[PDB]
Amino acid sequence: PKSMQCKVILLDGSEYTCDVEKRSRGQVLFDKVCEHLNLLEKDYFGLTYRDAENQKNWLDPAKEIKKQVRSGAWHFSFNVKFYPPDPAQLSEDITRYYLCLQLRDDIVSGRLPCSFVTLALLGSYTVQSELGDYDPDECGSDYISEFRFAPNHTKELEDKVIELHKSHRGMTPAEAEMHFLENAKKLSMYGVDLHHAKDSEGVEIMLGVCASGLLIYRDRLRINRFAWPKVLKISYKRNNFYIKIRPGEFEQFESTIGFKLPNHRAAKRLWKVCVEHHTFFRLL
Ligand SMILES: O=S1(=O)CCCN1Cc1cccc(F)c1
Ligand SMILES: O=S1(=O)CCCN1Cc1cccc(F)c1
Numbered sequence: 001p002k003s004m005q006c007k008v009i010l011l012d013g014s015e016y017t018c019d020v021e022k023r024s025r026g027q028v029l030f031d032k033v034c035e036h037l038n039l040l041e042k043d044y045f046g047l048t049y050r051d052a053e054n055q056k057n058w059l060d061p062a063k064e065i066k067k068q069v070r071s072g073a074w075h076f077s078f079n080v081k082f083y084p085p086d087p088a089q090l091s092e093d094i095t096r097y098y099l100c101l102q103l104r105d106d107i108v109s110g111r112l113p114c115s116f117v118t119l120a121l122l123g124s125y126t127v128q129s130e131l132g133d134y135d136p137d138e139c140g141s142d143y144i145s146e147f148r149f150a151p152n153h154t155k156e157l158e159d160k161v162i163e164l165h166k167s168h169r170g171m172t173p174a175e176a177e178m179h180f181l182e183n184a185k186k187l188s189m190y191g192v193d194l195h196h197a198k199d200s201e202g203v204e205i206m207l208g209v210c211a212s213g214l215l216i217y218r219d220r221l222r223i224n225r226f227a228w229p230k231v232l233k234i235s236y237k238r239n240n241f242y243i244k245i246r247p248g249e250f251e252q253f254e255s256t257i258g259f260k261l262p263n264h265r266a267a268k269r270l271w272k273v274c275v276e277h278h279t280f281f282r283l284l
Pocket of ligand 1: 084085280281283284
């Protein structure tokens with residue numbers, strides 16, 4: 001039975017190596033990574049790979065790894081797939097921990113925009129979680145933390161992290177991670193997966209997919225929002241993604257909004273992530 005070497009980038013930035021039989025489904029590899037991570041609350045997470053166009057794709061746990069990676073390397077990342085709107089309701093601290101690591105990368109990367117003050121507050125909770133109580137010994141007036149807190153670091157930001165860290169004395173890692181999550185979860189791009197698209201008139205928009213529904217970002221002024229309840233159906237055909245919207249009471253016919261994606265594969269990817277978010281953040 002022939003086995004392929006898999007390389008997984010973990011959220012702490014380290015590499016996990018393992019082998020699976022070459023006809024393995026994605027679930028086999030995912031189960032191995034989650035066991036390595038001592039992670040029980042697995043439903044929020046998934047593995048990504050990069051396709052031949054270099055786009056991030058979710059590894060479907062139900063299908064053969066080889067029919068997804070196709071010609072590419074068996075190289076993956078471990079990621080948050082479904083960002084819980086209320087992280088306080090996760091049953092385990094270790095779940096909250098991996099969620100924090102994913103959000104730190106979301107912030108540093110600029111996928112999750114954040115005010116100065118929220119960058120410093122989030123950074124201060126990470127420091128408290130990782131170093132414990134503020135100590136002046138590892139911090140003179142010139143201190144710069146090894147921790148990456150932001151897409152662009154400034155001395156003013158480093159100073160503010162230290163000022164807020166002083167205030168967290170006696171806070172345990174689990175408590176600091178919970179505070180990190182209570183702040184992060186309120187940010188307007190928390191858990192939003194953005195896709196480049198054109199509207200029916202060819203104007204460049206972004207479609208966001210999250211727990212609460214679909215977002216159309218036409219610009220900072222005029223942002224269309226479709227709670228899942230309002231979304232009747234979604235479809236893709238060629239390079240097109242269409243969404244059907246419920247009529248309001250005593251209106252006769254659903255409305256159709258169509259979008260143009262860059263190519264057929266981008267349309268299909270958007271459709272699948274929407275179906276999966278609808279299925280997950282339907283239930284309750
Ligand atoms: O994701 S969580 O916040 C973490 C545990 C409780 N959560 C479930 C949830 C949230 C929103 C809608 C729904 F059907 C189920
Ligand atoms: O529309 S479907 O592709 C039909 C089969 C799966 N779909 C689920 C769905 C229903 C409603 C909203 C939504 F985003 C996804």
